[PDB]
Design a protein around this motif. Structure first.
Motif, PDB file in Angstrom:
ATOM      1  N   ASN A 235     -11.768  -7.527  11.488  1.00 47.92           N
ATOM      2  CA  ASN A 235     -12.012  -6.474  10.410  1.00 47.92           C
ATOM      3  C   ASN A 235     -13.375  -7.389   9.209  1.00 47.92           C
ATOM      4  OD1 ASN A 235      -9.992  -5.386  12.055  1.00 47.92           O
ATOM      5  ND2 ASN A 235      -8.645  -6.427  10.467  1.00 47.92           N
TER       6      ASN A 235
ATOM      7  N   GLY B 159      -0.148   0.434  12.848  1.00 45.06           N
ATOM      8  CA  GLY B 159      -0.170  -0.665  13.734  1.00 45.06           C
ATOM      9  C   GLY B 159      -0.991  -1.318  13.890  1.00 45.06           C
ATOM     10  N   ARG B 160      -1.922  -1.983  13.316  1.00 47.87           N
ATOM     11  CA  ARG B 160      -2.943  -2.405  13.868  1.00 47.87           C
ATOM     12  C   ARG B 160      -2.363  -3.708  13.654  1.00 47.87           C
ATOM     13  NH1 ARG B 160      -8.612  -2.579  15.676  1.00 47.87           N
ATOM     14  NH2 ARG B 160      -9.672  -4.332  14.390  1.00 47.87           N
ATOM     15  N   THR B 161      -3.125  -4.822  14.713  1.00 47.98           N
ATOM     16  CA  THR B 161      -2.384  -6.721  14.082  1.00 47.98           C
ATOM     17  C   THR B 161      -3.164  -7.145  14.624  1.00 47.98           C
ATOM     18  OG1 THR B 161      -2.730  -6.724  16.699  1.00 47.98           O
ATOM     19  CG2 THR B 161      -0.510  -5.370  16.140  1.00 47.98           C
ATOM     20  N   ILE B 162      -3.703  -8.687  14.172  1.00 49.22           N
ATOM     21  CA  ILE B 162      -4.417  -9.117  14.110  1.00 49.22           C
ATOM     22  C   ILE B 162      -5.326  -9.459  15.402  1.00 49.22           C
ATOM     23  CG2 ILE B 162      -3.608 -11.698  14.449  1.00 49.22           C
ATOM     24  CD1 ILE B 162      -6.474 -10.390  12.394  1.00 49.22           C
ATOM     25  N   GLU B 163      -4.506  -9.696  16.994  1.00 50.63           N
ATOM     26  CA  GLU B 163      -4.898  -9.210  18.180  1.00 50.63           C
ATOM     27  C   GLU B 163      -6.427  -8.358  18.012  1.00 50.63           C
ATOM     28  OE1 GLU B 163      -2.373  -8.139  20.809  1.00 50.63           O
ATOM     29  OE2 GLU B 163      -2.331 -10.447  22.078  1.00 50.63           O
TER      30      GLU B 163
ATOM     31  N   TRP C 236       1.072  -1.256  -0.092  1.00 55.47           N
ATOM     32  CA  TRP C 236      -0.010   0.144   0.303  1.00 55.47           C
ATOM     33  C   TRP C 236       1.169   0.928  -0.276  1.00 55.47           C
ATOM     34  CZ3 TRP C 236      -5.276  -0.390  -0.782  1.00 55.47           C
ATOM     35  CH2 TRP C 236      -5.771  -1.740  -0.849  1.00 55.47           C
TER      36      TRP C 236
ATOM     37  N   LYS D  68      -0.022   4.291   0.869  1.00 54.35           N
ATOM     38  CA  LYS D  68      -0.681   5.189   1.496  1.00 54.35           C
ATOM     39  C   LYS D  68      -1.199   4.952   2.704  1.00 54.35           C
ATOM     40  CE  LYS D  68      -1.880   8.817  -1.511  1.00 54.35           C
ATOM     41  NZ  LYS D  68      -0.839  10.238  -2.138  1.00 54.35           N
ATOM     42  N   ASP D  69      -0.970   4.538   4.064  1.00 54.87           N
ATOM     43  CA  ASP D  69      -1.716   4.246   5.437  1.00 54.87           C
ATOM     44  C   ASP D  69      -1.818   5.922   5.750  1.00 54.87           C
ATOM     45  OD1 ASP D  69      -2.304   3.324   8.182  1.00 54.87           O
ATOM     46  OD2 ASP D  69      -0.461   1.813   8.208  1.00 54.87           O
TER      47      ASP D  69
ATOM     48  N   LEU E 237      -6.256   3.129   4.304  1.00 58.63           N
ATOM     49  CA  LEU E 237      -5.357   2.648   3.202  1.00 58.63           C
ATOM     50  C   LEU E 237      -5.850   2.778   1.314  1.00 58.63           C
ATOM     51  CD1 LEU E 237      -5.182  -0.994   4.734  1.00 58.63           C
ATOM     52  CD2 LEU E 237      -3.242   0.820   4.918  1.00 58.63           C
TER      53      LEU E 237
ATOM     54  N   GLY F 183      -8.585  -7.742  16.547  1.00 63.35           N
ATOM     55  CA  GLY F 183      -9.741  -8.065  16.310  1.00 63.35           C
ATOM     56  C   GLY F 183     -10.141  -8.259  14.592  1.00 63.35           C
TER      57      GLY F 183
ATOM     58  N   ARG G 294      -9.338   1.338  10.267  1.00 62.27           N
ATOM     59  CA  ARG G 294      -7.682   1.426   9.346  1.00 62.27           C
ATOM     60  C   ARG G 294      -8.312   2.087   7.754  1.00 62.27           C
ATOM     61  NH1 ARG G 294      -3.430   1.530   8.772  1.00 62.27           N
ATOM     62  NH2 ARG G 294      -2.027  -0.437   7.902  1.00 62.27           N
TER      63      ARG G 294
ATOM     64  N   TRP H  20     -12.064  -0.368   7.091  1.00 57.87           N
ATOM     65  CA  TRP H  20     -11.799  -1.232   8.424  1.00 57.87           C
ATOM     66  C   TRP H  20     -13.133  -0.852   8.139  1.00 57.87           C
ATOM     67  CZ3 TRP H  20      -6.937  -3.843   9.673  1.00 57.87           C
ATOM     68  CH2 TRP H  20      -6.039  -4.232   8.456  1.00 57.87           C
TER      69      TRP H  20
END
Ligand SMILES: [Cl-]
Ligand SMILES: [Cl-]
Ligand SMILES: [Cl-]
Ligand SMILES: [Cl-]
Ligand SMILES: [Cl-]
Ligand SMILES: [Cl-]
Ligand SMILES: [Cl-]
Ligand SMILES: [Cl-]
Ligand SMILES: [Cl-]
Ligand SMILES: [Cl-]
Ligand SMILES: [Cl-]
Ligand SMILES: [Cl-]
Ligand SMILES: [Cl-]
Ligand SMILES: [Cl-]
Ligand SMILES: [Cl-]
Lengths: 259, 260, 261, 259, 260, 260
Positions: free
Chosen positions: C139, C131-135, C123, C125-126, C179, C137, C177, C199
């Motif tokens: 999406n 920094g969002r992680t799978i932990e 991607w 552009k963020d 992107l 939750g 999120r 998201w």
């Protein structure tokens, strides 16, 4: 813009600083880190494997021995291109991992050592032609980085003209391979990765401890005996087997637990 | 220094010169050669497959017919870059493999090891464009040829594409013709072209590649009396193979499991 | 001649225009199209995956919502290089598939285009949620591609997207999120200009933001419908909502069309 | 004649008696033994796995600690049915493997301990309901068999009256499971298999070494301290992780060697 | 009602009666028959594999030689229990398959479908006990026989084990002899015995199974003049196969991927 | 003591009661539930698969339509033997999973967890025997029913097979009818029958299961006015699914890999 084709092999030297941390660190590696990593790089990493370290040998502490594993990636593009900093999902990474690996004390840590190399060894210094039929190897992979102020060419000459001949002379040593670290990728302080094979731990000790006593202490020495470098900061190493079951892009099936 | 991105497909034509050698050669290929090979090139070869040859057809010996298999690699970098010569573990290779394959005679003449590099995509689609797998089972006759010493490559090319191919194009038994120039510059292969020519079956192959080809004039450079006019195993190699193989080795190999 | 190293990720927006076509379309996708595709590109595509769309949300039709799936490839070379037109075995593709997907009309007396967008693998552009992680939750991942209509200056559209649309995303606590990337238009002539992924926690959150909050936007002069996205469904906007995970990671996970007992 | 449906789990305690033998033993296990074994039992063994042992803890030698791995099979039929002795291809088994594992000594050899169990643990003595979310376990699996002459009901009573209460009372111990060994299959000398979980090696030591010092020494004791049984002959053990990458029927792809 | 635990190995002897049918038969086997099969029995067959036949040896036609493959299943329940006749999806099975395999003629008396059930473990180990894979590649000749109508089964058995098997045992070319009685109760198979007889190679097979067998007297029930004295494809079938197959179908199949 | 060989297929009807729960339920199923499950039963379950439901059809709510999936296991032993209650690691199961599936209300009535054990093979084949995969894509409507308390089971069975099934047989839009009795002895499941009824598509399903069924008389035990006459989610559950699933979990699972 274009992305450069940059096939490379990298090694990360993963320690575990206390046996009490082993179950935690191993769980994180296998249950959390594997799937996060595959999720990120599956399209541009062709191999991702872990080689668990054999038990630390006598005096292995002086070689920055990684008591958990070597982590190996084969990349098609540079992981350090700034464009690769952006990721939809970031890795789950508790700060305790840094404690388990010794990067931070619990309350100087040791640096994270991530060395990029060409995919193929640059120098074949002993054992050319050895096959797997020749028997099981005790593969001692070591990376070293000369201290600040030491001329790199002087360090290179010492390695290849004083250290390596002692490996070549030892019948206990069956293989010597070396590459220069690709310093330009990520600023790794290491300069060389060597891999030095033996039949066994007794062979490793005989050569890397006893035969090396014959070396003169260099003026830049950070410890009194070979490797003469500060453990975990300017030397890291691991001894591994020929084979690992953790060839993770091919063999991972989730974190299946024992019954 | 940099490594060049050089996506290629290669083919090796693997013969078995006596049926008595079949079990030994096949064992070496599947028990020893697969894991050695995967161990070296997994990070820069994206596909590694064997296509066992169908039974040699009548007069197949005249076409350098490989009686074991075709070996196929897809590379991302050139295997002949001299930096690739260094390997931690070298392949386990009994010299007898060379006897089994015919590179050396057993204790009149050896046959060369033919290893042809190509682009990943066929350069010329000369018959059967648009054929799908639903159109039916193919007898896929893959043939590589190399013109003899002294023969001008453009003359041979001209003959190939203006005299030989039109015969394939006219035959209803031939369903497909594909061709690429061999990448000579990688490894000095003597071959000049790889063609793949499909039939319904062996009888179709024979009608076209033996009977229809009798209409060709014998070239002045001919090394045998009939088509392909090239010295078997030295200037022509070939195999007939199926559409599918179970030996897609980077995906399907699980070790040398033996029958109970 | 050389083949250029051109790592990219592509997305195809696969609609299903009637529920009566679903079984046939899904069969073709999983029984016929997978093996045909793998047979062609295994040596130069590193990942080939399908992400089934979540059920179409309320007013999803106005966003060119793909009712079957997103199809994702990661390429090492450009599929549009003319040398790649030649294939030993061509794929089995009847015109019926185009009916099912809405590209052509169903029976003799307008179609939707086939949208195949090429992107860099990372991607560009963020914009929210770094920094969002799978932990963090599960999406509800709303992937949408847009293309400004003919005669709209592309820089003007970009500025509208990033200065008027995205601030509404930023302000919605429901949106976790954002992107974006520019479509590589040069590869295949795709009419889309941007792919975004936006998201939410769930469908309700999507609706709150993408319908209710977007009512605050002024209607652009180039608008092709009255409300956001202001673009012609299926022609200038396509989208899908998908989960974080798919079981159809086809180069690793496919084992033939095994049927239920 | 019929074959009886006999679902069972078995455990083999595989030692490595010197570090010098480790590369050789490990090679034989993964290069030779896996394919020979899969070749024989693929049709009637539903799971075949290796769980490498954590590093031997202090005083682990007194517990018959297996320094290589536990080998685990799940069977649908009894491997000890005499009809199963006939095999088209027998396994490649050099005698040296017996030296590496300590069946042939360098005083006396250690027996080959191969214990058959039901697939499901028979007694859940502590920690019922524990999930994988509760954290990483240091899983200490121990098999014991009482000395010749000792009434099995007497051994059992000692185990339950004296030993189990200590395990249950220790906060360090998060799980205790047990099953009786199926005597009737292969003449195994072991009587029980227990699995006792801790957080780490330090917790293991505190319970299995320090808390056990309160036990009286039984009259049949073969060593002075708990487990009071002859190491490797009447007690064997290993500490293992929750997960293994060596789930061999699913995960094996031949002996791929490191580059 | 209960289902009986009935662990068994079965073997199907698959011929290809003309080379022209080989691409079509092979395709149906790998493209259509594998997924239909796995779809039906995945929950209760623990192994399903194909062992492609080595090239038919000299005089192999007289032994009912299967020119395609052996098909091998390992069952946990009997496939002939009438409750297993019901299947949600029936297999796709063109009549042409019966032609290709020789069960009916094209347009050549038909040969029956031979499907032999066995215990999972060989019942008799008659030579070469303890042989390992380290001892070398085997040419594994698997043969099933059924004595003709009217022949007492005990008499057949005694001939097999007292006259035939001693010639195999005596031959240094023969490294292994294994045998099991066929479970005739399962499906009415006409065969009585399956034997597997190993040699180093085709030449060895020939020396023993043709030359050495010339010493046998012709039995009074003989259906042909030389060993095996049984009607090819009706009362004797066989195949020579390798130790290893890539087609271990429950583990290795990834769909019908076609060559590029 | 012995464990009895008890080969069975089981179905669990998994609902998702609000679209807002879909991502969470789906994640739990694929990220958490698959590995916990495989960890417990790998050695004695030969297949474990999820079949996601097609979009709920019009009036599907009246049929107890599972809006997430059917979960399917094939067992070798009874999961309800009390010895199997002991497990080293118990499955991670948050209470919310029960809310997402509708077993407990969020803050109007909960629906039961329906887990039906069946023999591995359908007991009754009532329409469409011989249908192969080549015949086309199926909309497979799997429905389980349980007669209300106080209704004699034989009377219910009579109604099902004498009144309901004939409507299915009369409809050319219905291509298959299969049925088994639920093995109620295993776990006390309130269901009595599982049927699977195929159509071409949703409009075919509707034509038969809604319009054609209007001809039925309402039974005196009816819990709703129209067919199925049974309380949704309590006495009837169902799902429409495709022939294929990619979620064949013991073969196809590789951990929870997330989209980039
Ligand atoms: Cl420690
Ligand atoms: Cl320094
Ligand atoms: Cl020092
Ligand atoms: Cl020449
Ligand atoms: Cl020239
Ligand atoms: Cl000639
Ligand atoms: Cl426009
Ligand atoms: Cl509008
Ligand atoms: Cl030691
Ligand atoms: Cl003592
Ligand atoms: Cl023929
Ligand atoms: Cl007869
Ligand atoms: Cl005769
Ligand atoms: Cl009721
Ligand atoms: Cl009602």
């Amino acid at each position: 813009a274009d992305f450069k084709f940059e096939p490379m092999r990298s090694l990360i030297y993963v320690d575990c600083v206390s046996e009490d941390y082993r179950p935690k660190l191993q769980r994180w590696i296998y249950k959390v880190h594997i799937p996060d990593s595959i999720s990120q790089f599956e399209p541009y990493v062709t191999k991702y494997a872990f080689y668990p370290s054999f038990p630390i040998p006598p005096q292995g502490d002086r070689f920055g021995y990684a008591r958990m594993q070597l982590t190996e990636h084969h990349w098609l593009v540079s992981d350090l291109d700034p464009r690769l900093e952006i990721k939809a999902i970031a890795e789950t990474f508790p700060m305790d991992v840094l404690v388990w690996q010794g990067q931070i004390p619990a309350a100087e840590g040791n640096p994270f050592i991530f060395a990029f190399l060409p995919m193929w060894w640059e120098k074949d210094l002993k054992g050319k032609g050895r096959t797997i039929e020749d028997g099981a190897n005790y593969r001692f992979n070591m990376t070293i980085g000369f201290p600040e102020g030491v001329d790199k060419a002087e360090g290179e000459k010492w390695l290849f003209e004083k250290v390596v001949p002692i490996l070549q002379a030892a019948p206990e040593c069956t293989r010597v391979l070396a590459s220069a670290v690709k310093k330009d990728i990520n600023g790794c302080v290491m300069d060389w990765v060597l891999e030095i094979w033996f039949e066994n731990q007794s062979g490793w000790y005989k050569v890397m401890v006893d035969d090396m006593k014959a070396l003169e202490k260099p003026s830049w020495a950070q410890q009194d005996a070979f490797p003469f470098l500060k453990p975990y900061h300017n030397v890291c190493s691991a001894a591994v087997a020929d084979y690992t079951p953790s060839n993770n892009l091919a063999n991972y099936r989730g974190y299946i637990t024992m019954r």
